[PDB]
């Protein structure tokens, strides 16, 4: 909303550059960058007032390149990515260098890995409501499964009749490992969308589980036989069904 960060997820190989962008809330000239780890620690990196740097640390000064150009988005770039850079990068805007509230963007979740060869888009499937559930409860639960993906960088949504829905939906907080005791394991994620039986039983109603996967870009090289695992949407769907 107010603060717009892109991209929401990013995967890069060791030694590559990783660039992320932030558009501060209008009327707020100070932009802060934080790095948040899995332990919910917020590590201050650098801040700008308009085009000028106000405060920062040595690491950010040596390892990153950051700028807030006039009438362009702020950016923060890791010059040579390392495993230890994997984190959630948060941009906040504020009126001042101090004594003013922060407004945060959605962040950029960066993962840095050894080999992009392990990157895989998800397969997606929709499982239709059981008749037993319909008879037992007069409700109908659809289940979406996204499977075989890596890294765990996906956003799942439900679209009914071409409109995204939120009511009646629950998606797993975190994707699970298809092989837990294994690094580089691919992931799976499930979600449910529950509607009234009568709504499911209307063949004019259409249900789609959409998975936005974040993967490679065009500039990324790919010499593998399989399709280039690019950022992409994979969906599965079902129409309502009569008795």
């Amino acid at each position: 909303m107010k603060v717009i960060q892109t991209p929401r997820y990013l995967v890069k190989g060791q030694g590559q550059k990783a660039k992320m962008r932030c558009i501060p809330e209008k009327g707020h000239p100070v932009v802060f960058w934080y790095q948040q780890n899995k332990n919910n620690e917020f590590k201050f990196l650098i801040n700008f007032q308009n085009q000028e740097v106000l405060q920062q640390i040595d690491m950010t000064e040596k390892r990153f390149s950051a700028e807030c150009p006039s009438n362009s988005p702020c950016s923060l770039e890791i010059q040579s990515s390392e495993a230890g850079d994997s984190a959630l990068y948060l941009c906040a805007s504020s009126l001042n260098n101090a004594n003013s509230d922060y407004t945060f963007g959605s962040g950029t979740r960066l993962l840095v890995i050894e080999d992009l060869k392990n990157v895989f888009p998800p397969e997606v499937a929709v499982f239709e409501p059981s008749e037993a559930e319909i008879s037992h409860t007069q409700k109908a639960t659809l289940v979406c499964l996204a499977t075989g993906f890596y890294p765990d960088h996906v956003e799942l949504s439900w679209w009914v009749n071409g409109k995204e829905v939120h009511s009646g939906v629950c998606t797993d907080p975190q994707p699970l490992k298809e092989q837990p005791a294994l690094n580089d394991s691919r992931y799976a994620l499930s979600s449910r969308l529950r509607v009234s039986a009568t709504f499911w039983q209307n063949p004019r109603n259409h249900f789609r589980c959409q998975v936005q996967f974040y993967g490679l870009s065009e500039n990324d090289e790919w010499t593998q036989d399989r399709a280039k695992p690019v950022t992409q949407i994979v969906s599965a769907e079902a129409w309502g069904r009569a008795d």
Binding site: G105, P129, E133
Partner: protein
């Protein structure tokens, strides 16, 4: 580096209340409270003194006493998430963040109807759906890498003001059937097993 925040974790039944606190070890100029639901960090309150109140939340800040609180009343599902306080120290003009409170809000299941359903692929594949159990039931992971079982998840059908728990399980092993998908869990004795 961090501010002491309590509690670390909290589970509240819908409709109940509680107070989150941060304790400072120096004089603070102002405090902010945030809540994160993989969601974004949403600003709840910013204050330099006294209290502020918005809907079901209320915050207080006493620089002198070196604490700030955030009260939730009539807890709702949507209140779930991780709360952080963030405070600016007077002597450094730098912001330090609290260790965080993970809040889970448990829906209140009026009439539990525990059941395990088989669902088939829209396009010979199936998953098993354990649903409609009360917040009292716990879903355990499977101990064989060949079966996948998710944690419970609460959905809210607003139109009907209806909330429900479910977990999903699936496998490829030909020995897998919904009848025993959740054997690893302690499920209600009257769980419905169709077919």
């Amino acid at each position: 580096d961090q501010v002491e925040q309590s509690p670390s974790a909290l589970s509240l039944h819908e409709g109940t209340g509680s107070a989150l606190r941060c304790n400072f070890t120096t004089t603070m100029r102002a405090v902010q409270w945030f809540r994160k639901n993989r969601g974004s960090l949403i600003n709840l309150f910013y204050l330099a003194s006294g209290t502020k109140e918005n809907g079901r939340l209320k915050s207080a800040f006493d620089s002198k006493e070196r604490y700030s609180t955030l009260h939730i009343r009539d807890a709702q599902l949507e209140d779930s998430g991780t709360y952080f306080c963030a405070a600016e120290a007077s002597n450094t003009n730098k912001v330090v963040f609290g260790t965080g409170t993970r809040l889970q809000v448990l829906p209140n299941i009026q009439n539990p109807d525990p059941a395990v359903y088989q669902l088939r692929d829209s396009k010979d594949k199936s998953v098993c759906l354990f649903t409609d159990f009360d917040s009292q039931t716990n879903v355990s992971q499977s101990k064989d890498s060949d079966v996948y079982i998710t944690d419970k998840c609460v959905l809210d059908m607003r139109s009907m003001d209806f909330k429900s728990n479910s977990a999903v399980a699936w496998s490829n092993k030909s020995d897998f059937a919904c009848a025993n998908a959740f054997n690893n869990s302690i499920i209600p004795e009257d769980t419905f097993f169709p077919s």
